Amino acid sequence: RQLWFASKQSLTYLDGTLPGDFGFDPLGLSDPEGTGGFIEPRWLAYGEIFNGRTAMMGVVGMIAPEALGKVGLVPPETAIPWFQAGAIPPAGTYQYWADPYTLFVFEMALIGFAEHRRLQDWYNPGSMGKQYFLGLEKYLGGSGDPAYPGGPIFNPLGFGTKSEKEMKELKLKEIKNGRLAMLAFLGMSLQAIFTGVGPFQNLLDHLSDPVNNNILTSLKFH
Amino acid sequence: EVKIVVDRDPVKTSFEEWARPGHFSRTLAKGPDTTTWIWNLHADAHDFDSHTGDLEEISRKVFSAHFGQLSIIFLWLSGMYFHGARFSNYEAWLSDPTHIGPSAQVVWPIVGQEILNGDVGGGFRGIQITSGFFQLWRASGITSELQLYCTAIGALVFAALMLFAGWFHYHKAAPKLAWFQDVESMLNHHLAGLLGLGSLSWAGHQIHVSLPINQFLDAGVDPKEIPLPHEFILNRDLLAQLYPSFAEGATPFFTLNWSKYAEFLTFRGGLDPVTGGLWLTDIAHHHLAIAILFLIAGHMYRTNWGIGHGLKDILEAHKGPFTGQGHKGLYEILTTSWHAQLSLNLAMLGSTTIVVAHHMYSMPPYPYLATDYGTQLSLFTHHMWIGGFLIVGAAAHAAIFMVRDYDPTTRYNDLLDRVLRHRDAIISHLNWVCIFLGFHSFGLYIHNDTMSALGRPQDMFSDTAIQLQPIFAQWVQNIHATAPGVTAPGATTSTSLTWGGGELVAVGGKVALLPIPLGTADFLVHHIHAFTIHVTVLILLKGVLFARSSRLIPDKANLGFRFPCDGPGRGGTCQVSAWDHVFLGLFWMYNAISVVIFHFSWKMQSDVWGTISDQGVVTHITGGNFAQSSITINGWLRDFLWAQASQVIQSYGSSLSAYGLFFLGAHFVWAFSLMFLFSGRGYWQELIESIVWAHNKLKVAPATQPRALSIIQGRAVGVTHYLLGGIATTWAFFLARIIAVG
Amino acid sequence: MRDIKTYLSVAPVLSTLWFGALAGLLIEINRLFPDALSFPFF
Amino acid sequence: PERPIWFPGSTPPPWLDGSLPGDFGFDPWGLGSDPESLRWNVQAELVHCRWAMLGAAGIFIPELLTKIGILNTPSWYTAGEQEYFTDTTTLFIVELILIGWAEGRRWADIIKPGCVNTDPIFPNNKLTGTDVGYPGGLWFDPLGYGTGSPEKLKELRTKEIKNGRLAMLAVMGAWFQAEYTGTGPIDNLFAHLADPGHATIFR
Numbered sequence A: 001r002q003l004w005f006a007s008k009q010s011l012t013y014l015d016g017t018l019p020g021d022f023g024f025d026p027l028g029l030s031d032p033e034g035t036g037g038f039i040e041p042r043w044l045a046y047g048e049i050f051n052g053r054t055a056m057m058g059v060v061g062m063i064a065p066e067a068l069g070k071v072g073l074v075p076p077e078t079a080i081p082w083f084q085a086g087a088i089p090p091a092g093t094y095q096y097w098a099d100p101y102t103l104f105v106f107e108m109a110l111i112g113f114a115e116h117r118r119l120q121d122w123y124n125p126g127s128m129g130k131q132y133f134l135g136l137e138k139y140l141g142g143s144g145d146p147a148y149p150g151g152p153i154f155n156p157l158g159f160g161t162k163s164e165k166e167m168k169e170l171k172l173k174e175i176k177n178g179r180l181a182m183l184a185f186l187g188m189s190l191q192a193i194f195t196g197v198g199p200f201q202n203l204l205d206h207l208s209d210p211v212n213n214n215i216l217t218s219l220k221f222h
Numbered sequence B: 001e002v003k004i005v006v007d008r009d010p011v012k013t014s015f016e017e018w019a020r021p022g023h024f025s026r027t028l029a030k031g032p033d034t035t036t037w038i039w040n041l042h043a044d045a046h047d048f049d050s051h052t053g054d055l056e057e058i059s060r061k062v063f064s065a066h067f068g069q070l071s072i073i074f075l076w077l078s079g080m081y082f083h084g085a086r087f088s089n090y091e092a093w094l095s096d097p098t099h100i101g102p103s104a105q106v107v108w109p110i111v112g113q114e115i116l117n118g119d120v121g122g123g124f125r126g127i128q129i130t131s132g133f134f135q136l137w138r139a140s141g142i143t144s145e146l147q148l149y150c151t152a153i154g155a156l157v158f159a160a161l162m163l164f165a166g167w168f169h170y171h172k173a174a175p176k177l178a179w180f181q182d183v184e185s186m187l188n189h190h191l192a193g194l195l196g197l198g199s200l201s202w203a204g205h206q207i208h209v210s211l212p213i214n215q216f217l218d219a220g221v222d223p224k225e226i227p228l229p230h231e232f233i234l235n236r237d238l239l240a241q242l243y244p245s246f247a248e249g250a251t252p253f254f255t256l257n258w259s260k261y262a263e264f265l266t267f268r269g270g271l272d273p274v275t276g277g278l279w280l281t282d283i284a285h286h287h288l289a290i291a292i293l294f295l296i297a298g299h300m301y302r303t304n305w306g307i308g309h310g311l312k313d314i315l316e317a318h319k320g321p322f323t324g325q326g327h328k329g330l331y332e333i334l335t336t337s338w339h340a341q342l343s344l345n346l347a348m349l350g351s352t353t354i355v356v357a358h359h360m361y362s363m364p365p366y367p368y369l370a371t372d373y374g375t376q377l378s379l380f381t382h383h384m385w386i387g388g389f390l391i392v393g394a395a396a397h398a399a400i401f402m403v404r405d406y407d408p409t410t411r412y413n414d415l416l417d418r419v420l421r422h423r424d425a426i427i428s429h430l431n432w433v434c435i436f437l438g439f440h441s442f443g444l445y446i447h448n449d450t451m452s453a454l455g456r457p458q459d460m461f462s463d464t465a466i467q468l469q470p471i472f473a474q475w476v477q478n479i480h481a482t483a484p485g486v487t488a489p490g491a492t493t494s495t496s497l498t499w500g501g502g503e504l505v506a507v508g509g510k511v512a513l514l515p516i517p518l519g520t521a522d523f524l525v526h527h528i529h530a531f532t533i534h535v536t537v538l539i540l541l542k543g544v545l546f547a548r549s550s551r552l553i554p555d556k557a558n559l560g561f562r563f564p565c566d567g568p569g570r571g572g573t574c575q576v577s578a579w580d581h582v583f584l585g586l587f588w589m590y591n592a593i594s595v596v597i598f599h600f601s602w603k604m605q606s607d608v609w610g611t612i613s614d615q616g617v618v619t620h621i622t623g624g625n626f627a628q629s630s631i632t633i634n635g636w637l638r639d640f641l642w643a644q645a646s647q648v649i650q651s652y653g654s655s656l657s658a659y660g661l662f663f664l665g666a667h668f669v670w671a672f673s674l675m676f677l678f679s680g681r682g683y684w685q686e687l688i689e690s691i692v693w694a695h696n697k698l699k700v701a702p703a704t705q706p707r708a709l710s711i712i713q714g715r716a717v718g719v720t721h722y723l724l725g726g727i728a729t730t731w732a733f734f735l736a737r738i739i740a741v742g
Numbered sequence C: 001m002r003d004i005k006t007y008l009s010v011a012p013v014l015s016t017l018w019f020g021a022l023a024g025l026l027i028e029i030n031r032l033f034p035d036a037l038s039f040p041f042f
Numbered sequence D: 001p002e003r004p005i006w007f008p009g010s011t012p013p014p015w016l017d018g019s020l021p022g023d024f025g026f027d028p029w030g031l032g033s034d035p036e037s038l039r040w041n042v043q044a045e046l047v048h049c050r051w052a053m054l055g056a057a058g059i060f061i062p063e064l065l066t067k068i069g070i071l072n073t074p075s076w077y078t079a080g081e082q083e084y085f086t087d088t089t090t091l092f093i094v095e096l097i098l099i100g101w102a103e104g105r106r107w108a109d110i111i112k113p114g115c116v117n118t119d120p121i122f123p124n125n126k127l128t129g130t131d132v133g134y135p136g137g138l139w140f141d142p143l144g145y146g147t148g149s150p151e152k153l154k155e156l157r158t159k160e161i162k163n164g165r166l167a168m169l170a171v172m173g174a175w176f177q178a179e180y181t182g183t184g185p186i187d188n189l190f191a192h193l194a195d196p197g198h199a200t201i202f203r
């Protein structure tokens, strides 16, 4: 059990049974003595894995389109740095089949079904496989662990087929990857504010010229 | 340690108690015995201490209650921003702020009351405001009706946030006691988080928005063409065209070459000749300097890691020979009693409000605030009254602590003990001074008046006769005038313009400020203020010390905080409760403040304000008569009350009519209060009985039996009206007078 | 639901609702028959 | 009990038990928490279901048929302003009387069931309905169609409310659309069909 910047408070509750544990917690948050809302160690763990997963597909989409624009068969029109895809109009935009704010509400409705149902199973286990939902109820009950619902829709082939250690090994891989992605996305942002030439370019700027080291420069431009 | 343990769902959200009035108190809940019941319902609504006996619930109620108070303020702010956007000539005011009155209220024309819509100019009509928001919205570079609208929505949203927050933290997840009592972290966050990061963030908005934009308007441009504030923050070259230090970016800040930002971070001092306000570079620097000081101060008290102080140990090292055990034990009695903290906070916040009013008239911080005589008089008068009341409140709650929470068997303190033991000395000595000042402050006015009446104007106390020169104020004025020479080499000019040296600042034919002389006539009135302040201290201080016992009544504590009397024995014991000492203090607070805001109004019109000739000669509003006519009591009647009430009295038939009515209306309420103060209850109870009999005759006798007001309510209503009549009369007296003459 | 109606029936809440209606009525009449110094119908 | 709930997996309020037609356990504020208000409100929702159903028929069908060339009906929005064979006021007055007659008798049945169903003039014209709000009778059931077994009316009545709820939204749809769009409802349909991703509330 490797520990990183541990604390006496941390090792009272960070037992290591939770995957991704390294006993790093110096702000009293996951402390189980204080539990109102959103300070439950489960909920925080629930928010930990989900944020990582969103990062794990958020990161890749944050470097895929321009880098695939480096050699790939994507017509350069839809090959753009991530912040000018249309999310931030003052960085730029692109005219998709829609006009924006209809894409948003569409997206917020599609998400609404998955999200809210994803919430109820945390409140009431097995509830989301009870009321009629055009079939599919046989799967949407979940395996009892909200973060790891399982089922043929979520775990189609089935890994963690039968090994808890592997699953514990796997889930350890799932969080450390998750932490890696959260920091990484925080990297793609703060680079953008200072560099302002896009994420993957800013690695070349340090590739062709390691003596660039924009740290010492700290020039700001859009 | 320091953690966040709260509860889950203490009290269930339901409407039952909304239909059981007086549920909170066991006594009130049984029902309306008589009409005395419907008065005790409100008198004990908020007294959370009397409802329950443990600190945890009292805490959660005050914590959630504040959220309501916080929410209303946001709703109040939201209206002010909304009203300024939909019903104001703000955008017109941004063109000629010198000579277009700020108007942000428009009345519906029903019963002829559209005469109230005054010709405030700018192609608009409406009630001319005086709260001075317009100078505040210009100092922040608003320059649009749209931007005033969006903040109004933003202000409104937070009101829903706060109000929601209040609900959540009392019915859903209420904090525990251990959360509240951890007062080291409390201070630690407020100093660094609220106070500290509040300024730094604001010092941000001034650097990127208020400064470069207002530098356009002051340079002189129509408001419609000023590039929007997000253009500077995007197009960094625009900030270059004004402020070349913005080319290098934030790297000098990191290489300690701080003298590169000298274009927009300075130490000028003085006032701006163009706009008559402070230099926004100084203000920009000021919040930045404050930010660092607060933030570092935030990191003092130990919270969870090794570093930091212990507030308990700081109070337990200062103990002296004369004092004995010193500040040991004050940590408890300032932690397990809300009435201690409320009394201590009230005094400081009360005092600070006053210092705010002394600075905002001498170092005018917003542009085009100096030459706004309607605003200066109101803002100075407003915060004096607010400051006056809050101090009186600190006496009441200190008195309540002595009766309810104080206990010398557990929460024992030594200093608060020694102070009690020699209380006879404290009051008697404070009694002698209040007499000494009484004879030598008012008496000099009386002697002046007598000699003047007898035809002996060479025995009066004045600059032209026996002289009383304030030298100590005249000396300190001298020091601040020459401070820019030696003792503050950085400063270009003095911190103000009222120092006994320098030169005036003229803005659009209206004096901003000039050195305020201090002769004999000012010496007397400063010793009037020293008199009424002392007397007000005497009443409140006597109440606090003698709130538990005295040589008359040895068990006054057992009688509570606000009880009427102890009967007519021992010669008569009317008004011995600490509540009746604060009841008496209110008048003197009303007395001290009123002369202060009289002193300010006459001194500024006679010696400072007024138009200015193109040639350069200055003519003040009243012709500079303060230095001769303010030394005789009859002088304060002829040339201040009688001669400056002309505008209010003849304000009928023009937009200032509403002040003419309030002037009278406030007299009526003032004279009305006397019926309650002078008379007593036992007469009004009997007359009620005969009236009640007639209703028995016609069968219309109610079942909540009529009763006269309780003894301490007859006083409470008596003082309240008296204060309302007195303050409002001055209100209508001031606004109508100053609005017409400038 | 019952508790809400009861609360709405307590004296102060009726007062503002009753007087508010009364204020609206008088204001309307003065808007339609203004100045009204005499009653010149009969 | 196990009937579908508006919010699946939530706990429906006790006073909603699925008996009434259209009871998907939806009452967050508990407006029908007490039985009596429920009884009145059941009527309130019921009649509102019928008026809008005609209103939806009143707005959409003519505007549809006038959008194509078959007829001449103007916009429902300015329908009131139009001048018909007499002044609007008297027709509204005439509407006040006749509706007040039915809205009078219906009122009596609500406050006192079963005391209104016999013809005041020709007493052999008695009405057949038994449930409050379902008058029955030959005037209002020219062939019956309401006198059947349960689990059929519950189906049928739910087929009456569930359509009515569909109307009340739609007519308020035609309401707000006519205000902030400049045209009729059908245009707001078509301009949404040419560029669905562009022409919306966000212009």
Ligand code: CLA
Residues within 6 Å of the ligand: B431, B434, B435, B436, B437, B438, B439, B442, B443, B446, B535, B538, B539, B584, B587, B588
């Ligand atoms: C105009 C009305 C008035 C006057 C003159 C006074 C005067 C006084 N009040 Mg007072 N008071 C008043 C209204 C007034 N009150 C009202 C309305 C209230 C209710 C709120 C109070 C409540 C109140 C309290 C609660 C207290 C006072 C106190 C005082 C005394 C302190 C001032 C002092 O020592 O000066 C000295 C006296 C004067 C300035 C009066 C004028 C004297 C001149 C200079 C000369 C007089 C002539 C001279 C003696 C020649 C004699 C001639 C010969 C033929 C006899 C003083 C006697 C305080 C006190 O006594 O403790 C110190 C105190 O605690 N009063």
Ligand SMILES: CC(/C=C/C=C(C)/C=C/[C@@]12O[C@]1(C)C[C@@H](O)CC2(C)C)=C\C=C\C=C(C)\C=C\C=C(C)\C=C\[C@@]12O[C@]1(C)C[C@@H](O)CC2(C)C
Residues within 6 Å of the ligand: D026, D027, D028, D029, D030, D031, D048, D051, D052, D053, D054, D055, D056, D058, D059, D075, D076, D077, D079, D080, D167, D168, D169, D171, D172
């Ligand atoms: C939408 C509506 C009511 C909606 C009520 C809602 C959402 C309440 C929901 C909730 O309470 C519940 C359920 C449960 C609570 O716990 C939660 C909330 C959320 C609080 C009524 C519309 C009702 C709509 C109606 C009645 C429409 C009537 C149409 C009429 C009368 C005809 C009009 C015409 O004649 C004119 C005007 C002009 C002609 O040219 C044209 C025609 C059309 C012919």
Ligand SMILES: CC1=C[C@H](O)CC(C)(C)[C@H]1/C=C/C(C)=C/C=C/C(C)=C/C=C/C=C(C)/C=C/C=C(C)/C=C/C1=C(C)C[C@H](O)CC1(C)C
Residues within 6 Å of the ligand: A024, A025, A026, A027, A028, A029, A051, A052, A054, A055, A057, A058, A059, A060, A061, A062, A082, A083, A084, A085, A086, A087, A182, A183, A185, A186
């Ligand atoms: C633990 C602890 C404890 C102690 O006691 C104290 C402390 C230390 C303080 C703490 C710490 C904490 C932390 C650090 C945290 C972090 C987190 C994160 C970062 C997350 C992220 C997170 C993040 C995330 C999710 C992200 C995501 C993203 C995404 C999706 C993206 C998207 C996109 C794209 C693609 C493109 C387009 O065009 C745009 C967009 C739309 C934009």
Ligand SMILES: CC1=C(C/C=C(\C)CCC[C@H](C)CCC[C@H](C)CCCC(C)C)C(=O)c2ccccc2C1=O
Residues within 6 Å of the ligand: B675, B676, B677, B679, B680, B681, B684, B685, B707, B708, B709, B710, B711, B713, B714, B715
């Ligand atoms: C006048 C006076 C009264 C009499 C005042 C009373 C009894 C209260 C004033 C009457 C109030 C206004 C009750 C009327 C309000 C009722 C709720 C009825 C409301 C109906 C209105 C809508 C018309 C005292 O009781 C008293 C007690 C102690 C010292 C001095 C005095 C004192 O001076």
Ligand code: SF4
Residues within 6 Å of the ligand: B564, B565, B566, B567, B568, B569, B572, B573, B574, B575, B711
């Ligand atoms: S007069 Fe009133 S206050 Fe004085 S003793 Fe009698 S009862 Fe008490």
